[model samples]
Target chain A: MASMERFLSVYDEVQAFLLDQLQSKYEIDPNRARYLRIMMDTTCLGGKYFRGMTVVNVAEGFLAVTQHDEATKERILHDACVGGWMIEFLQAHYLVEDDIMDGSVMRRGKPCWYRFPGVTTQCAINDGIILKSWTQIMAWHYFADRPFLKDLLCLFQKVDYATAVGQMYDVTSMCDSNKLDPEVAQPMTTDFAEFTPAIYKRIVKYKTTFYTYLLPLVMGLLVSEAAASVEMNLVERVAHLIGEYFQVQDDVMDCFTPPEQLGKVGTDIEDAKCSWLAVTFLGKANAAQVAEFKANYGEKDPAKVAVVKRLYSKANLQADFAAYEAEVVREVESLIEQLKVKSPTFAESVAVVWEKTHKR
Target chain B: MASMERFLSVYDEVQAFLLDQLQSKYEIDPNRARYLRIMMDTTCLGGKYFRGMTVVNVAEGFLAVTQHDEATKERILHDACVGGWMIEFLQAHYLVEDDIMDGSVMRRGKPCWYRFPGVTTQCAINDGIILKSWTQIMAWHYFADRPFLKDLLCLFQKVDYATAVGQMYDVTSMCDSNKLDPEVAQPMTTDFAEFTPAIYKRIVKYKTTFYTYLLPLVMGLLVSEAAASVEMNLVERVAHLIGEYFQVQDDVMDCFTPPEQLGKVGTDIEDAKCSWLAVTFLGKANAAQVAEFKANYGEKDPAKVAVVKRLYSKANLQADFAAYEAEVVREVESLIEQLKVKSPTFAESVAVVWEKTHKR
Candidate 1:
């Protein structure tokens, strides 16, 4: 808990550190440096810091299991904090660009960065690139001496590329055709025909799991120097499972929770997302029900949306998802038990993270 | 120029190499992989390949200086091609995002990637990030054995960061305040007060010089393993000079050349860019001329735009610029001569590149 609090406060220190480096060390001009500083604060500062906390908490687990003197522990803690911040930095980049792509208005209870008075699409686009590039810059800054520095940099790159690929899948998944005009300015709507559970899982795997779930855990293993002792292939297997479980919850929360409680309105239905509910509902619904559901989905009208929700309830999709969620948790806990032999706190690390998602 | 011819055709090979690697080696979904392939083609293929050619040609110059076995020579050529393609990839990423930022319609005589039917802002945003990430991915794939691969990746990051910072500078340069409404959808216009050569040059150094001019040359030296022998600081000096000259030409061509001759119309005056002509005219003109130019600049009217052009003529900005341009060439030639003492063909490598920009 102290480590989590420390991880949150360290971001304030990072803001200054990053600003000074860009201004003087990197020789960025005064006006431009200020712009970057503001952009950094706007995008990176407001997040729940959930992914970053996983990095710090997991790295702490690794640190506790391993032997280190006071100085070494201090060094490890500093590195872990930075390792954690990199993911937060990465998420900021994603959010800034995602806001632009989705034509989003508010983020974390404030106007989106692109919707900022001085900030527009171009500023946010460039800001997103800067935020992403800084993750690499921070790697070189902190771990320049470490041999795993390249691996750390590569890990970020790998996850980033995967996330980008995933976004491509999600964006174009339900589009009517590749050649449709940009006569409208909203995010592409989904098609029910291709909205299978397999397709939805693939989207979540790339877009959600890689960046949101897997990257932070791996970064923790890397920063704490525990990655070598662990069979990373097996880690990825758990990560894939955890990522699926995590995203499925998000899908459920979208439809179930109020916007007041959830922080944002669930537009998965109206936006025609390849959501778990849509896919699962289609899988379970009768032929006539499926036809009716399709007609009701993706419409802006409240009546149509209510009909879609009625279809979901009739199909017992909520209970089905609950059953699926429990299955995945049990499945993951079993694997974590097996993994306990190889890495002591990794299971605990993963279990706590899994618990956090459930608590949400 | 056979090397130039080879460089032109190598892109075709690279397109296949990149696509195959992403599909199988990277484990991307077929649907996702196909989307990436199409995005790559739209963004990377149609460029002039001018930047890429510099990499191959400069590397060839270095190759000629060092004696190698036939096999060694062939291997060097392959690395050079990949190195060359990476810059092209970087350019593609920039252009994709730039079109979104600038609200551009066409690029290189085709619809901008984002302007394509299904490719809107979000698709293009992710595509840009992917294109940039692949540059790093290619580095690892081709040069994982080399120690300098990390350094090569760093070079790309450094350039990318610089360019992003440069974009921030350019985007915010003329804005009145930090907070303003995004009521209009054009790029920020310039303020006559801050539109000096010093400000313009700084903008060009980061935005134009680093990525466009310096990155390729440094990349050439890096791939050919000639960076160590040459003082990179001095190389940056020449890079700075060359980049200024190169952008100056673009500015001139924009104003002077017809849209039929030039790829795009001269919108620098209308766009209120911190162009070389604007800076020069402002510096030389009387109070009356300055006031007149200020009134006419950034107007979307033909009459007002022509009035600004007349001011440029009145100040003999064209002839003065020609004088400044010659001085830079002589200075660069002298630096190249000094550079020759260290590396045998590096001067020739830089010289031919200097000549290509001049040719354009």
Candidate 2:
């Protein structure tokens, strides 16, 4: 609970650090700084800080398990906080660009950054690239003297590359000739008929799990003065399962949750997203239902959306999701129990995640 | 001349290296590799290789001046070529994204990469980031053990940031309310009346000079086994001048040269670009002429384009460009002469640039 409190405070510290960077380090001109300031405030500050909290919590767990002295712990914690914020920074970059790519109009209950007054796709692209580059620079600044600095930088680079590749898969797989202009080679729409669980899992693993779960947790452990005895591959596997579950839950909630509760209106169906719900429904729906579903899916009309929702009800996707959710939680618990043999707090660290994310 | 031949061959090697990276190092799935390969072939290959050539030529000059042994020369030369290709890689990233942002239909006499069948702006964004990430990876692969590796990477980072900021200025400045839909926050058009030489120079310095001229030349000198005498600040000043001049020429050629000669149709007039011609003409044109110019400029109509071209002729822009070209050459020659006092081949290195770029 105390670690969670500290994790929440990381957002404030990250903001101060970024402002310090803009003023003292980059020394950008006033006009340009205004846009960047807006970007920082809008994109980086308002997120749930899930990945960031994981970093600080895992670092605290490592210190608690290793029994480091208070002085060394303080220094490592400071660096770990920086690492945590770096993950947030990277996420901000991805989201700004991703929103544009997905043609998302809103994010986190407000207009997407690209949709902001005077902020075009060009600025968004540059802003995202700048944020990414800033992460590398900040990582070097904070961890340059550490033994694991190379490992940390390499990890960020690898994850960034992997996430982009995953995005490529998501975008390219959905491409249908009929959905785009005839001259356009790739359509941005996914056909529900072609959706598969394996494809969904791969996308979730590369795009969400590595960056959101494994990165923060691994960064925390790497930065700590404690000897790393935990198997990282095992840690990553656990993170992947958790991330997959998170995305699956998101898919379910999109169709089921009220707009007020979700913060933004759901458009996964309208956007032709290759969602878990769609794949599950495709497997369950009758041929006549499938024909109706295909007609209703990806349509902007409210009537069509209602038809799709009605079909989803008939296929019992909500109940299916409930059962699937229980199964994933059990799997995660079993894995956490196994990890307890490695470190007492490893399970606690993962349990923190399981508790934070596994609930509605 | 032999060095020039080696310089020209850098593009070939860069492609081979990038393909090898796709296969062995990055190990991207075949689906993503197809997009990256198309980006590589289209964006990276067809260019004049002016930047890439500058790097290899300058490195060879250093080797010749310092008189390194054959084997060491070969090795450093190879690394410098990698650095050369890195610049090309960086350029490819920029061009792909920039074309999409500027709404460019063609580049290098072909449909812009983003305009290619099935390709979308999202893929362009990811592909560009991937190319940039690859450059950093390649730099580490080649120069990790060297002292200048940090300098090389930092330089690349700084230049990349500067170029993007330059693009930001170009895009944001052109944005006028009338050009965009009412709900769209940003307009993507520039007013010719407000164009100034200072603004044009700033854009050229940031967008073209830093990455194209300065980055390649500085990279070569930084990595050379020989060093000590040349003040890089002075080298950069010279590079900046040459780069500015080169862009000015490009601006001129866009208006005056035939599409066949330029290899791409001149859209500077239609794209609301901040061109050197527009800036220069603004200083000289009377109030009536300025009114005519504003109306004629940024119009997609063929008649409007013709009217703008006729105004340029009346204003004697062709003659003005000739005088400007002479002045630039004289200034560059003076700088090169000073450089020759430091390293004889320094002038030769620059002369290689003057020769390649000075022609139509």
Candidate 3:
């Protein structure tokens, strides 16, 4: 597919197929099926389609140089698109659950699934799991004939497990004011104790990299039967390194962008998340700015939030993050070059994902 | 394993082993591991463990009539206990997530994991997934050598999908009253229009039976390498029948039992759950009781709750449930007799789980 829609049309195809299966073979309640129809559209649609498209993109790059008949190539790419939707389904599940957990109000320029009409947190909670269940369910349905089915399922699990581990690491480090209803939430406070560079990098590595960059690439490679031919050790390093910079860029922007353009309201400051900007601000702030950081960081007061926002500006995080981004891009380029010596075809695919790693 | 502890002691062993793996092989943060250790005990260590013991019980009965050396028998039994803990892990994940969805205050005689100190809903959400992730993670570690590993993994997904479908069916039929924080909660109202015998049975089958009865028995048989010998179609029916009666009995007791003894504060009446008592009350009530049922059901007022409770007692639900339980047992016994003819050894195994189906 030359453009994103040509690839993303597969979501519609797969969504309708699953809905029919639910209504017919699975024989779910019609009412529940009606609800899920909206849920499928609302949750799976409107992303930048970055992670999902990587599945097709990586495979396309591989097929460009490989010796395969036209019919076989078409079939392989069609299957890749299906894998794309499965990863998309996994992300949709993550977004639904994380929105509820983070008390998010909007995503993808629309309301979070939990905030949709007649859908309470209870309904959304179960729906989050249903979306996840379909990933494996659909995998079993479409890919059961393949020898690599187990590998695909295990890849899904691996990413999911890393994500939870990352979230567990992040959530436990903070107070709960941003995450729960204020009536039930803990009093707000931020801990600066865990601001080590290693922890910040670790959080980014798990919470974003595994699912966003690595899953689509690894899955595409595995499906192409190209995994053994390529040096997967290099693929992981490339994904992890770029994923680190990719998330740090996101952290940089969360403080600067309007939620509408960002497709999400940002509240890492009030939540006292261990974001890269927060890590940098802590190390560089003057005594007066540093003292205010504790006072305003995790508190829910809007005025205090503005105070933290100004402090982040005062430290000039934009220039710092831009420098870091280019620094990361250089290293990825060098590594991508090295990858060409061993597996030029796979290196071409890695470069395609790396190209989008720094885009707004 | 003569006592529950003999079976349950596997939890501590497996919990520690997994904890070590999380810290070492998984390289999780020390702080998170500490939190998980308490989370491990709090979520997985309670209940009567009827589901867990069934795995070992079924395997034991199968082993009784089969040929095996003492050494092999002990090894197989030990592996069965490991499978028991895996099932127990799945249940722990369910309860943690379900408690949050139901807005429940207690479970297994203690505060829900979400309500524990410093463990807000954010932390608990990730923890629930972590618990689920380990079921497969541990299985991959322990059962990778077995040829039936795919069957075991597929079994876990099947049960999880069915339970979510059941919960989705249960949650969407009501307004959000009991299952969300009231500040964010919808106005209280219960829809009685969906209460039908078929719908009620469907709810019980998907939400309760697949995991509670079918998973343990099927898992034990698969691990015993006897799945091919047994007719699984009958096992599903047997599980479906008993699990239906089992949940209905629970619904009956929830209205009559005190909160402390029940290990949870029962709120289904106020939530207007389409439970057995509600179905019977709607069918048999007088004009006054029928009119008042609409006014009181799903309302949070304690006095309103008491009104609904009195009507259920007047309807004589306990006696009705006892009658239903025996009616269920007779059919199960007859099925058991028929099953004995084709696979006498496996039939002997299934009979052991059926014995506990009626116990308190």
Candidate 4:
């Protein structure tokens, strides 16, 4: 109770108890217990608990009188949030395996789960599979016979499919040199710049917002039997803004600090990653500067790495990063203005965008 | 239907059509669609279809008075058989990923899905994930309302867990030298060989017989409320026999035949697979022979491989494989006799095994 309050304050007592139950259930080994707990902790920190919160909020919204007792409210929140967290768990599992496949060494300023000593590349892969299987088991146990169980389950599946596709695009774009040739590089052309936002929008919408922001709200809508049009437009707008802010920040952080400092490997140049900075750097660099950038930074060599960073800096990449960061914040603010919070679909985007822009 | 007379029967027709439906419904692309179809096809080829056949038979058995209607009986058979095929689909998904993790090149005489052009190792891994997701989707749609739905779902989960664990063991043993240490390599010995068979039994219980064979029969029992007692014992025994025979033959075929003839990759040594024949050869080799075998035969070089094959033949590895095959088959014979087939459970197993194995 003491620790749960310090970490997650949305649920009074039982949510904490269920959180502990989840931690204990997954505490397979003392060493792994710590790792799993760290993952669970990372997911718990600083969110609206909105998904979990909405479990209570919208369920009550369904009842005409809105007269549910505290315990029932707690139960609704507990189950819905746990299911929401279940989505996060699945994300962790996918990210862990993805980091290794993508040769990512750090995440959130720590070594990726696969990069840890006891976790080999192979075990890391299985870990992801186990995480997914565990989520399904969690769903079956928690939501059996809830009228909206199938909808809830399908929501999870849909998110999972979206994520898998997002990952495929991500890996393919970064890794498939042949497919992403000539045209992928930046030029300061007006038309190209106009259209280039598509990649950034996609990475944000599919990778970050769809699961993290859209899924939780959708799960709430499904669980609460909330109207589609009323909640969905709000969900899409808020989720898009929050998701974009979160990802633009991620791009800034990628180049702002070292991999060790950020707990994730530095990005953009690493494996030709398509990033917010990459687009801006391309847009800004002239033919000669871009040639120097490609020679020194196009490949993954350490010296070449330094050259690319210099080229990016010279091309005003940092300035672009700063502008994009603020642009997203303005977007989130507009999203907040649009949402009528008392409505089931209002901007709980607060939890999603919270501190998402801090360092960026 | 043209394909039905060959490898594609009505059962296969049903599965392929469903797979097509799923692909289109989900808007899966040509690239992914091809791989998904291949996996579905692979599932159809291997193993007996007894378990699926059982779900239908059991459902039919329960409705004995109602069974006068032929269409109802056939529908029950189709559903049960599809459930059984679900296990095969599960196995294919697991093995596709496993083959990549193990660096296996060929399966069922074709390039391992990952080995195909543009199907990089990453896609290989995700392909399996999608297959698993699809299987669960199928199960969810098909068995939503049955009394046995809970049990069926539990059985699928357990099968998945066991298979993943088996894969873990298989992949782990391949990496660690201690696993292949000669001191533990006795024929029929519970060394590394124990890993697959032990898991296979768990798989067979779930994959081959329980879900495939026992499920249909049990559905009948559940409907009649007659699932308990000596009949249960007989069904368990029969499932075990058929499952062992199914896998043991796979081992024999892999070890004894040429690659073209066997219709599976024959170069097991290159992958360092702890196959039945190789394990037997290791057990029978002397110290100097073992050292030479390790240095020469187990490696990928052709001349050295020929020397290793000579050493294996000198050690009578072929004869050893034949003996082990006989013993496992003998065990199957003994178990089937004890089950008597007079009971409904026994009759179902007999009919299934005969239809799948004896017919050809």
RMSD of each: 2.8, 4.2, 3.6, 7.5
Where in model 3 is the C-alpha error above 4 Å? Answer: A1-6, A175-191, B3-6, B175-191, B286-288
Arranged by TM-score with the best first, the candidates are 1, 3, 2, 4
What's the true lDDT of residue A77 in model 4?
Answer: 56
Give fnat, all candidates: 0.49, 0.34, 0.32, 0.09
State the DockQ of every prediction.
0.48, 0.33, 0.36, 0.17
Off by over 4 Å in 4: A1-74, A77-81, A108-119, A145-148, A174-195, A219-230, A281-297, A302-307, A315-360, B1-89, B136-154, B173-237, B264-346, B354-360
Task: After superposing candidate 2 on the true structure, give the runs of residues whose Cα lies further than 4 Å from its correct spot.
Answer: A1-28, A63-75, A140-147, A175-194, A225-227, A285-296, A338-342, B1-32, B65-74, B140-147, B175-194, B225-229, B294-296, B299-304, B340-342
For residue B240, give model 2's deviation from the true position in Å.
Answer: 1.4
Task: Kindly report which residue stretches of model 1 are placed more than 4 angstroms away from their true locations once superposed.
Answer: A25-27, A176-191, B25-32, B176-191
Error of 3 at A208 (Å): 0.7
Model 3 per-residue lDDT at B65: 79
Q: Which is the leading candidate under DockQ?
A: 1
Chain B TM-scores across candidates: 0.91, 0.89, 0.92, 0.70
> What is the Å distance of residue A200 in model 4 from its true position?
3.4
lDDT for each residue of candidate 3 in B108-221, tens digit (9 for 90 to 100)? 998888887677787787788888888887787777788878888888887888888878767754543233331244554444655667767877888889999899889888
lDDT of 1 at A265: 66
Best by TM-score: 1
What tens digits encode model 2's per-residue C-alpha lDDT throughout A135-234?
7767766676888876777778778877876776666556642343313465444345447787778777877888988888788778874436676667
DockQ-better candidate, 1 vs 2: 1
For residues B1-360, could you state the per-residue lDDT of candidate 4 as single tens digits? 221232125445656665676456543344444544664565346544444444444544445534346775555555555565565566567667767666677776777776766566665677677667666666666666666666666656644654554444444334432332212231222233333434334433432443434444554444333455235666666655555556545554654568787766666565455555555666676778867766763457768767766776688766775676577567656655665544545454455563464333
* TM-score-best of 1 and 3: 1
